[PDB]
Each structure stands twice: as structure tokens, then as C-alpha cells.
Amino acid sequence: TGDNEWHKLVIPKGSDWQIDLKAEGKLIVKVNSGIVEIFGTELAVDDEYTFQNWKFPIYAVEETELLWKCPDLTTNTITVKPNHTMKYIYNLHFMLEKIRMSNFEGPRVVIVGGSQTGKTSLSRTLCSYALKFNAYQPLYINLDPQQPIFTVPGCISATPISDILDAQLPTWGQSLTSGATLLHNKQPMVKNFGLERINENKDLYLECISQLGQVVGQRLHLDPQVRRSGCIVDTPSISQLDENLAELHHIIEKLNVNIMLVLCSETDPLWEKVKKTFGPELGNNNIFFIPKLDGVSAVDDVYKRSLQRTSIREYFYGSLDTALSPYAIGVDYEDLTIWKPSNVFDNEVGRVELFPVTITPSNLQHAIIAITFAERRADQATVIKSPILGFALITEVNEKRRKLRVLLPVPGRLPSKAMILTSYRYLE
């Protein structure tokens, strides 16, 4: 039960085709008629879209006839289901549009909720919808270092959504390249957290948020288009933050948030907790609740690690329809200056500080490293505050010749800059 031919499918108005591709599953979709969207991004008719290693809905705004090709699906297996909660997304979107249009500046919204309530899907959809009717450029702010969006994992980020997302990509789209592309790409501001979970170093996590908030403010001050559009701030699971929600307080202050969106039932203890804690600061009129979003499903860590791997590959080499050429170089041990953040595992208590790394295969082989703008000779306090230039991958550490093979996204020389060891590993 496989097959490599095209198959016709009609999706009813208001239904999702729920797709779940696992690993090496490859799906091609071609729309014949109607309107379908992937997290608010409209598929063009007669154009082929290719998907891989992703779990996502294709939503029918109108009754849609399409053609699909995939050896790992059959007509008797595909899942099509009515979605009853889109109206909540529309109501919220058009309220926000009203603020972008009439208020002195655009709304700055934080989205909060439990594990897999649909915070990131809501964010993506609202960003897509913001482009559609009045050509806004909202800032998408990702505060979940486990979700790779426009960059590699381990980062928080701010990115203006200045043109359509790539409906093919779980990563939403890509950052700028040196050549010609089918879609206009994005220009993100990225801060390196570097660790696998925020509880490995809460202090450093909050440090990154403060650094992002400062440069986000500098952008909004200089950019009237983005300022009028506002910000969509996406957070990690609420269960990952502290009991008293003091991390949310910090996010709200550093990013100048004025609207809060909570994903939960009016009877979840979270609802009253949020009103009691943030109501005196934001005003209860500016705290909204969305019930369960339909279709949203739980993900395991196998699935999260799979999106992370794909995002690392994409950073260096591009995607299926955007082939990029990264650059491999050999360097000596003496050519590299590498630091490592404090963490609970290595240092028992995570602080805002870095320690020097001694070059070993066990330490560095297969590691993603952040490249800063700081001199090699820069002190630790300078390196901590230094903006991120990009990322590199150490594919081989030869102990006997005292040399490394390093992969760069940009062809040319190894940057003469201070670098920071990440917890992420990638084998080609």
C-alpha cells in the first residue's frame, strides 16, 4: 500500500487535512481549485509544494480539490477533519489589526500556555494573516530555544515578517542568502542560549531576553513600519517556567508587552492565576483566553530532535528548492578561541558566565558553535554581550596533527572572532 502516482482529494470547507510525515516521508501537493492554507499561508494553484519530516494541517478556507503524491500514504489512510476553532484565530487577528490601524503603535502580544496547546501554530497563523490585508511587518519573537525558527536550535530571536512564510518548512522560512531565491527571505536578530533546556541556566536565559529586548526597542524606535505592526511573542511551555511566573514578568518588561493571550479553559487554575498576577500591570481588559485549538497534538522528543537536525542542515545547505553551498576549511588548534556557558550539569548552578574550552574530540567533534562579533582577545564580559555573527560546525578534530575540519555557511576565511560552544551536535 504505497504507490508513486497522483491522487485526487477534495477537502470540505472548514476542514483540515491532517498530515504526519515520519523521517524520510516525502509528499507533493498540487492544488487544482479552491483555497488552502498552511498556518495562514495560502498555497498557489497549479504550483507544486514538497513536504518532509513534519506534522501539520492543510486547512480548507474554501472547498478545495487537490492532487497529492506520496509513497507512504494511501487514499484510505489520509485524515480529513472539521476544524471548529478557527473563528477564535480570526476574532483575535482582526482585533489586533484594529490596533495596528488606530493606536499610536502596534500591539505587543505574548502567547502563553501548557505543552502543545498550539502557541507556535497560533503565532505562525497570526503572522501570516498580518501580511494579508494591510501589508504589516510584525516582529515574530521566539523565546523557545528548543524550536528552531529561521535559524538553528538553542536560540531566541526576533524577525520581521515582511513577506510570505515558506509553507513547505517547519522552520517557517530562511534567513538571507547571497543569490536569487523563489521567495523573499528573512533578516533575523538571534541571541545564543546554547543549552538544551532553559532550566540548565535560568539566569543566562533571562540575560538573552534582556539583550533581545534592548535591540528590539532600538529597531522599533528606528522602523515605523515594524513599530505600527507590533510584536508576536511566543513562549516555551508554562510548565518550564517558575511557579510564581517571575520569568513572564521579566519577558513582559523587557519586551514592553501590552496584550496577553492564554491558551486554556476558563476553569483551568492558570486563567485566574494569570489575571491575579498580570492584571494589575496589563489591565484585565488586555488579557484574553482561547479555548483548546482543534487538531493540535502532543509531540515527543524524538520528533523535536528531528526538527532540530533538519534546521541545522538547512542553515548550511538550504532546502530542497533552495540549494546553498557552504564552505569547509582546515585550521590548527591555535586558530580557535572557544568559550562554554555555565550549566547545572557541569557547574551545579547556572550563572551568567563563560569558561574556556580546551580542544578535544570529546568536547568539540560534531559541535555547533556560535561565532560572535568580538575579538579573539576579548574578555569574558565582552564575549557575553557580543552579538552573533553566525554558526559553524566542527566535523572532525584530529588530535595527532592538532587540526580541525570546520564547516562555514559563508565561503572565505575563518572569522577571527571569539566563539561559544553550543550543546547541539550534528553528524552528516
Binding site: 511587518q137 520581521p160 515582511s162 513577506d163 534567513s175 538571507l176 542568502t177 547571497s178 543569490g179 536569487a180 523573499h184 527571505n185 533578516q187 533575523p188 536578530m189 538571534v190 534592548q214 535591540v215 532600538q218 529597531r219 524606535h221 528606528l222 522602523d223 513600519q225 515594524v226 542553515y315 548550511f316 538550504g318 546553498l324 553551498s325 557552504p326 564552505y327 562579533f373 552579538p387 552573533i388 555573527l389 553566525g390 555557511p409 559563508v410 565561503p411
Partner: peptide, 25 residues
């Protein structure tokens, strides 16, 4: 035969002053 690559990111000061209309126009 022609090739392209990923770009480095912009510094804080260059990103703050950057206009996405440069990308899209």
C-alpha cells in the same frame, strides 16, 4: 553552475537601522 550561500547576520547596530524594504523592493 552558479552558486550562492547563507549570509552572516547583522550586528545590533546594523540590524536596528535595517529596513526590510531593502529585501522586498
Amino acid at each position: 553552475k552558479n552558486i550562492q550561500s547563507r549570509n552572516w547576520y547583522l550586528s545590533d547596530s546594523q540590524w536596528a537601522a535595517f529596513k526590510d524594504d531593502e529585501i522586498t523592493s
